Amino acid sequence: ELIKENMPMKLYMEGTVNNHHFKCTSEGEGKPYEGTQTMRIKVVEGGPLPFAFDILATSFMXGSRTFIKHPPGIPDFFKQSFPEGFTWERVTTYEDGGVLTATQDTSLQDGCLIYNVKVRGVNFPANGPVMQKKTLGWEASTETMYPADGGLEGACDMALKLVGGGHLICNLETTYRSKKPATNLKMPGVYNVDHRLERIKEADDETYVEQHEVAVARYS
Ligand SMILES: [Ca+2]
Ligand code: NI
Ligand code: NI
Ligand code: NI
């Protein structure tokens, strides 16, 4: 219907991480009913970024919620929200004190999903792995989804691989809000989304990135 078996995406992102401003654009496509997508991402202002691109990854199924495979038995808050669309607001808290806040608008225009993202990263240690570009991508994760007075909340711990073999742990708290009246939505129960966000290709300086995500919902 409005969400076809194949859907394209376009994105604009702007914000700051510590004292550095940047802008990104991306375009991609995916299979909403399979839970898969690919995004081709350009740093268009503020590049090369003096921090790990990994801290932005969930802002592009961590950020592209229409492409989560929901079995028919799990009401799909995101796909039900069209044509009106939805928003999300997240705080990602790293164990070393970095905090990445992101807010996002999702709309549907002429059969493309359109994302507008605002990023604010603060307090990343100057000599820590994010600002020193010592990260190696995200491990697979599970986000628990909680129906919340007409919205949906998500809660996830994620693990950022580090050069040396360790991990940097962070916590995600997200609020997902529909632009449809909640009374017009079927709310799901509590459920889980298993996510796999993978770096496919990059410019040496991370000013071009391709990343892939797979995301599939299940009842615990
Ligand atoms: Ca590991
Ligand atoms: Ni700005
Ligand atoms: Ni700078
Ligand atoms: Ni299928």
Side-chain angles (χ1 to χ4, degrees):
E1 19 102 89
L2 286 179
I3 304 305
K4 305 290 217 320
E5 280 165 12
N6 300 276
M7 287 295 284
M9 300 167 283
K10 295 172 208 163
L11 171 153
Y12 178 81
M13 173 184 293
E14 179 176 346
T16 55
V17 170
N18 289 7
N19 58 358
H20 189 86
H21 188 276
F22 70 99
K23 299 175 182 173
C24 299
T25 64
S26 73
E27 56 87 18
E29 60 279 324
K31 292 196 185 75
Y33 303 91
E34 310 299 348
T36 61
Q37 62 188 303
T38 298
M39 192 80 81
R40 293 169 290 275
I41 306 161
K42 299 174 177 178
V43 179
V44 300
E45 203 185 273
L49 305 170
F51 57 84
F53 188 100
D54 282 328
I55 70 172
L56 303 178
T58 61
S59 297
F60 293 95
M61 317 246 204
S64 180
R65 309 298 299 190
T66 303
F67 303 84
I68 297 168
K69 194 178 199 185
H70 287 75
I74 307 183
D76 189 333
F77 181 89
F78 303 106
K79 294 185 186 65
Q80 286 182 77
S81 289
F82 293 102
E84 294 89 352
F86 61 85
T87 66
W88 60 257
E89 309 86 29
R90 186 174 293 142
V91 180
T92 300
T93 303
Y94 288 79
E95 63 179 326
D96 68 350
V99 179
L100 191 292
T101 300
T103 69
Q104 196 263 19
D105 186 274
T106 295
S107 65
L108 175 67
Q109 308 180 13
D110 295 313
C112 295
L113 289 154
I114 305 300
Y115 303 159
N116 284 281
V117 198
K118 297 165 149 192
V119 169
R120 297 293 181 186
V122 303
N123 293 334
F124 288 89
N127 193 34
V130 167
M131 299 310 295
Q132 299 297 37
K133 295 170 49 69
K134 299 299 184 247
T135 72
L136 297 172
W138 295 102
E139 301 190 342
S141 64
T142 300
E143 184 182 15
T144 307
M145 305 303 298
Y146 296 95
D149 280 312
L152 187 64
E153 290 193 332
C156 185
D157 303 281
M158 296 184 69
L160 183 52
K161 294 179 179 299
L162 302 181
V163 174
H167 313 76
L168 184 64
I169 303 306
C170 62
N171 171 266
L172 289 61
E173 285 289 336
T174 314
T175 61
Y176 302 100
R177 297 183 291 138
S178 184
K179 296 187 187 177
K180 246 196 178 60
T183 187
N184 296 351
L185 297 171
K186 182 75 186 178
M187 299 298 289
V190 175
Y191 71 102
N192 295 121
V193 178
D194 297 325
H195 294 271
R196 213 186 73 224
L197 188 163
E198 294 167 346
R199 175 78 55 87
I200 301 306
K201 151 147 62 159
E202 66 202 66
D204 289 354
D205 68 1
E206 283 179 341
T207 60
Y208 180 75
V209 170
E210 296 183 3
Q211 61 185 41
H212 182 261
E213 185 183 327
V214 184
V216 183
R218 64 175 168 78
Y219 273 138
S220 210

